[PDB]
A paper describes a structure:
Intracellular cargos are sorted by structural MAPs that decorate the MT surface. The MAP7 projection domain binds to kinesin’s coiled-coil stalk in vitro, recruits kinesin to MTs, and activates its motility.
The α-helical density for MAP7 is not uniform. Segment I (residues 113-139), which is the best-resolved region, makes extensive interactions with tubulin: Q113 and E117 of MAP7 are within hydrogen-bonding distance of N197 and S155 of β-tubulin, respectively; R114 and K127 of MAP7 engage in electrostatic interactions with E159 and D414 of β-tubulin, respectively. We also identified potential hydrogen bonds between R128, R131, and K136 of MAP7 and the mainchain oxygens of E411 and G410 of β-tubulin and V159 of α-tubulin, respectively. Segment II (residues 100-113) faces a cavity at the intra-tubulin dimer and has the weakest density in our map.
Author numbering:
A (entry chain C): 1 to 44, 47 to 360, 369 to 436
B (entry chain A): 87 to 139
C (entry chain D), D (entry chain B): 1 to 439
Write the structure that this text describes.
């Protein structure tokens, strides 16, 4: 019934999105060639949330791939399941962004975006009930932030009442990947905060720590980090596809998760996570899932939640469970650790339970928190921005495309206001 | 009494939607003026470089 | 003869209804496919099940019910399941997207799209009745479809039928255990607009049931299946009077006259006894006096509240199975004597009693013991005033900073409605205070 | 898809280019005659080497390059040698007489005779590209033809293409080792007229390489063949990103965005590690952390300078082969921790990281060990300001007596040009002083 359009953009976006689709195909029994070879009727009842059906009983991901440099797409097509995305949805330019936001937003993206939108319109026209869009991208890069906010804005104008969700990779606290990240990130946040309904913040620094500390991977690769991200993205929309005792979709999560319209940046997490060797020594129970979810060391955002308070938390569980255990454990957490929740919201936790676990597990759970501790991310970006802006380091690269100091100044002010607004409630 | 309560709610809702549409049009106009300004600034810089060569 | 229409709204509504219809079928001997192995008489007569099932075809029994939701998932579970052949396709009504716990989404923006469809089905069903007595509506308070749609439906039924009774079975927000962070807004708004249209609303509470299951049935993991079966048993005892002969029969109309002393106070809390597993039932004597007393303990309320802090205004006892009127009367006299149970000075005759000959039915695969006799109790007390007070407090804390307010305003609900609903609830709290003062 | 044009100018330019084309052929499996033993696909596809070779005939691979000299000798060695069948005859362009170390002959008197031929060939090659990203120009600073002709060429390309990147690989005059008595004049004149047209010039130094060969490879006689092979490995690591899949890809544009903080400061120095002979490699542990630390060692710079005298503005680390992103991240954090490595206060984010899956290739008959992983580093530092200062000093000492001035004046240069070039270099030194001051 409700349908989701998936848009992936830039190198990062395409790497994560390709893994996302691999995971969904396994959950639904869909072969790399598009054929269905599953074993349960429940795999087909809601297949159309994510796939269009092609003659010959084949399924086609309702996804769009966007880039300014063709090399990324060749990698997507040659890898596993590269063959399931339709060729008409590979939309791309030739120039690349060069990590220049201004090029990504005002020149190269400015020309490419019309083709992207024409593809989006064809896909939304096939829906019986479009519910929303999911966008996968990075914040510190060129194509990612350039096209990221260019598309978000265009879509919001055309579909003002649909749900706009993003999964964003944010700049890390110790090591930069790009020299000019502070400019790209400040300019991007300025626009995301006005146009989206919810943003998930993902930090590779945190993902490296989780896969090293918990899963004990001494040689993790981007494929493994992408797996962790994918597991969360899939968990968020579980209830649109599978039956359960108490459901929640994307619209419900937004209603419960955002008390004020600008405070919609979330810190995701996932449980259970164990190393393979230790898998044999710990029983999984609902209390165990609760214990791993509410854990500073298990957050996928690089921000310690113990430095702030929770405006709200969602807990979505998958697999057969006692409803009483779920309700009781959430109550125990709020009562024993009351110093971390705001007193002006009776009941800070929302829950949902679907009856079908991820393949291979008896049960699992996804955590989404809305914490005032997030101000640390925004604060860090603002200070780094300031240090470079004051000496105009690397600034001529943006003003050479026609941007100016006024645009940079406004973005800086909004970054600072968002921080003040989060502080206001602690 | 029932119809009157329902009609007032309908009127409020419609006025709200008209304000939303106005805000969306203003956002669009601001972005288009901005993008056009950017194109003109870029054009002028490029012409000056050619004059210099 | 006498006919009753069941309306099931939203997730909780539909899931409870499934528990109810399984139980009705077992008691009457109706198979999931609507057939009856002993279908000797077709098209009417008594066959008392004609209260709840329509007689058609050549032996098809069709339940008089309507299931409504804004989202398709829970209804599809019904449409493809065991009882898919039991309900008429037009009794299963769905929208496309839910209300997302937004009262306004349900009431003002989405519900308007299916309310006319829902009402037309109710009308067609009602027109086939000759002795319709009332409607039974199943819903939850903190839900989107639950309260948004129920309020919309109640207003429309008050206009079209007017005089038929409207009884509501609903799940009150629990004092500790919640499922949403916006429940205080939804519950205050529901009462404000629905209070004047209901004749009697029976309250239950998931948190209280969780504890009953744990203490009496020794269930360490009381999931929704178990809660729905306990709720179903209460509903069945209420309607059993219409379906089976008793010593003292009680119809639906007499309930609202006995349990509602003032038009704004109509929220009796339900209880039930005995609740016992088979293992313990084997060793106990579940006599009339013992069951009757059990119903008054604070440890067996289906609503988490504490009855010792209020007074009883009205009390309705419904007995089933092997019950003798003299034992019933003696048990009541003992209760009136006991000083810990207080009644208001203005109600010298607080008890009304019905007795039915048909004993309770145990669902195969169930938790409950088979017993010879059981008692359902409905009590209207002032103790509940405290629950209302807690709810009003939670509302004030959030409204004070306007948390989540824009989600309702954006759907067309003028902001001032929140203030008016709050003022109205303050009046309700005061009404309880006044009736509770002896003079 | 994405294409790159290589331009090789003068004696140094042509000889380095020969080292590069041998290496490209080995990595792709292309024979000296342009044939491929495994030529299964003809005319496109991937075949990522289509970045550097065009597909012609029926299986011939032709490098996208132009070799230009005023002196016919170095090109004739190419024309009659091993790779004589690899290049198109019009890609080998010669004049009749060299510049004889006179900047002005290379720029004003002789260079004008072939510049139109050179540009037309570049145009024809550029027109066959669909995604041309930029040009790579190989030259020396103290050379007559090298700088005279390159400066002339740079001006013409910046007018005709404009927006394509222009990257330059060049040999900086060594502080002690020199071949001409007039290098100070040629180098000052080159910077003055070419600074504004280049996007990024990567610096190498023969004197520094000789020390590397002696210490790391134990070579007591490091002739130009060895130097050219080491230079080739750096160039290859830079362009490998276009040719091979990586974990994190980097195009050519990204280098100027990350390495040039101000338009007048664009001279990053290159380094490379590990450099090791096979005999030592057998016993070494060439881990990611060790290779990374090696790049910051003053003894491994390819430019004779001392990094401890300045601060870093931006560092680009290009990893190849068996590299895990986690280790790269940890190694960088270690570098930032060390107090001996300083960064400017205005650059809190001084690193850029690229990782490619394809390991480095050893040329048969070479000195270098085969390794699993290697790192190329490009970095923009203020330490180089001292090298500019030494060069300006040498200029002043000679200009003061007008040594050799008439050799440039006699070719049409005005005396005023020497004075203007010197004033501009004074400005360049000041530009470094300002960025080097924290506040
Ligand atoms: N006793 C009992 N309560 C239930 C059951 N399922 C859900 N609930 C209660 O229902 C309440 C929420 O209202 P819903 O009925 O889910 O609302 P809805 O109809 O789906 O509409 P939305 O809120 O918009 O999703 C929660 O407080 C739950 O405790 C059930 O099977 N048994
Ligand atoms: N690394 C390296 N440097 C070289 C090589 N050949 C020449 N050079 C350098 O080139 C510098 C002089 O400029 P060239 O390019 O050789 O001379 P040219 O291009 O023919 O122009 P003229 O000065 O007129 O002869 C010297 O300082 C040498 O160090 C080589 O094979 N490898
Ligand atoms: N989690 C994850 N992050 C990636 C991957 N590839 C690149 N990134 C991140 O992407 C950022 C660089 O911007 P990028 O999106 O690649 O450049 P763009 O193509 O111009 O948008 C860095 O912060 C990288 O850490 C991947 O496979 N997984
Ligand atoms: Mg629902
Ligand atoms: Mg020469």
């Amino acid at each position: 019934m409700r349908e989701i359009v998936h848009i992936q953009a830039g190198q990062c976006g395409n790497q994560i999105g390709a893994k996302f689709w691999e995971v969904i195909s396994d959950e639904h029994g869909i072969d790399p060639t598009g054929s269905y070879h599953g074993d349960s009727d429940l795999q087909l009842e809601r297949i159309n949330v994510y796939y269009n059906e092609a003659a010959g009983n084949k399924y086609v991901p309702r996804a769009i791939l966007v880039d300014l440099e063709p090399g990324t797409m060749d990698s997507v097509r040659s890898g596993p399941f590269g063959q399931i995305f339709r060729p008409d949805n590979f939309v791309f330019g030739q120039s690349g962004a060069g990590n220049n936001w201004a090029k990504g937003h005002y020149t190269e993206g400015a020309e490419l975006v019309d083709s992207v939108l024409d593809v989006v319109r064809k896909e939304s026209e096939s829906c019986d009930c479009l519910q929303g869009f999911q966008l996968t991208h990075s914040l510190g890069g060129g194509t990612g932030s350039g096209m990221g906010t260019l598309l978000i804005s265009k879509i919001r104008e055309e579909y003002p009442d649909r749900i706009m969700n993003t999964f964003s990779v944010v700049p890390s606290p110790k090591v930069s990947d790009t020299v000019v990240e502070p400019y790209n990130a400040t300019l991007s946040v300025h626009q995301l905060v006005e146009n989206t309904d919810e943003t998930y913040c993902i930090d590779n620094e945190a993902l490296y720590d989780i896969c090293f500390r918990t899963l004990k991977l001494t040689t993790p690769t981007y494929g493994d980090l992408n797996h962790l991200v994918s597991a969360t993205m899939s968990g968020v929309t579980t209830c649109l596809r599978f039956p359960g005792q108490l459901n929640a979709d994307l619209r419900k999560l937004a209603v419960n998760m955002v008390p004020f319209p600008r405070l919609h940046f979330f810190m995701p997490g996932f449980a259970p996570l164990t190393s393979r060797g230790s898998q044999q020594y710990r029983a999984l129970t609902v209390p165990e899932l609760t214990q791993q979810m509410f854990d500073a060391k298990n957050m996928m955002a690089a921000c310690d939640p113990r430095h702030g308070r929770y405006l709200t938390v969602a807990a979505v569980f998958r697999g057969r469970m006692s409803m009483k255990e779920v309700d009781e454990q959430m109550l125990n957490v709020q009562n024993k650790n009351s110093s971390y929740f705001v007193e002006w919201i009776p009941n800070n936790v929302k829950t949902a339970v679907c009856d079908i676990p991820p393949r291979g597990l008896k049960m699992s759970a996804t955590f989404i928190g809305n914490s005032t501790a997030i101000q640390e991310l925004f604060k860090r970006i603002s200070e780094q921005f300031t240090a470079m802006f004051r000496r105009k380091a690397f600034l001529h690269w943006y003003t050479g495309e026609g941007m100016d100091e006024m645009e940079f100044t406004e973005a800086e002010s909004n970054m600072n206001d968002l921080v003040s607004e989060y502080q206001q409630y602690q | 009494v029932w119809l009157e309560r329902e009609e007032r709610a309908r009127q409020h809702y419609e006025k709200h939607l008209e304000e939303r549409k106005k805000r969306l049009e203003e956002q669009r106009q601001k972005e288009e003026r901005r993008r056009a300004a950017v194109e003109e600034k870029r054009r002028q810089r490029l012409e000056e470089d050619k004059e210099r060569h | 003869m006498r006919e009753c229409i069941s309306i099931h709204v939203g997730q909780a509504g539909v899931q409870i209804g499934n528990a109810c219809w399984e139980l009705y079928c077992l008691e009457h001997g109706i198979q999931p496919d609507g057939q009856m192995p002993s279908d000797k008489t077709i098209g009417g007569g008594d066959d008392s099940f004609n209260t709840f099932f329509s007689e058609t075809g050549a032996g098809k029994h069709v339940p008089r019910a309507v299931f409504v939701d804004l989202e398709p998932t829970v209804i599809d579970e019904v449409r493809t399941g065991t009882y898919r052949q039991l309900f008429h396709p037009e009794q299963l009504i769905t929208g496309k997207e839910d209300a997302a716990n937004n009262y306004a989404r349900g009431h003002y923006t989405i519900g308007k799209e299916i309310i006319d469809l829902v009402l037309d089905r109710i009308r067609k069903l009602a027109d086939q009745c000759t002795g319709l007595q009332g409607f039974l509506v199943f819903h939850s308070f903190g839900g989107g479809t639950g309260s948004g749609f129920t309020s919309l439906l109640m207003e429309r039924l008050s206009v079209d039928y007017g005089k038929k009774s409207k009884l509501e079975f609903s799940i009150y927000p629990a004092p500790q255990v919640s499922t949403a962070v916006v429940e205080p807004y939804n519950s205050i708004l529901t009462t404000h607009t629905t209070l004047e249209h209901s004749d009697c609303a029976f309250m239950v509470d998931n948190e209280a049931i969780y504890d009953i299951c744990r203490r009496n049935l020794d269930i360490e993991r009381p999931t929704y299946t178990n809660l729905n079966r306990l709720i179903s048993q209460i509903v069945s005892s209420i309607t059993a009077s219409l379906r089976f002969d008793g010593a003292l029969n009680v119809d639906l109309t007499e309930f609202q006259t006995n349990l509602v002393p003032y038009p704004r106070i109509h929220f009796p809390l339900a209880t039930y006894a005995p609740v016992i597993s088979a293992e313990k039932a084997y060793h106990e004597q579940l006599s009339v006096a013992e069951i009757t007393n059990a119903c008054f303990e604070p440890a067996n309320q289906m609503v988490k509240c504490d009855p010792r802090h209020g007074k009883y205004m009205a009390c309705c006892l419904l007995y089933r199975g092997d019950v003798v009127p003299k034992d019933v009367n003696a048990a009541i006299a003992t209760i009136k004597t006991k000083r810990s149970i207080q009644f208001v000075d203005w109600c010298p005759t607080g008890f009304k009693v019905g007795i039915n000959y048909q004993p309770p039915t145990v669902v195969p695969g169930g938790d409950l013991a088979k017993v010879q006799r059981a008692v359902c109790m409905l009590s209207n007390t002032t103790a509940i005033a405290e629950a209302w007070a807690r709810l009003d407090h939670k509302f004030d804390l959030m409204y004070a900073k306007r948390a989540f307010v824009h989600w309702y305003v954006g759907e067309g609900m003028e902001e001032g409605e929140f203030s008016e609903a709050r003022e109205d609830m303050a009046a309700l709290e005061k009404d309880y205070e006044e009736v509770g003062v002896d003079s």
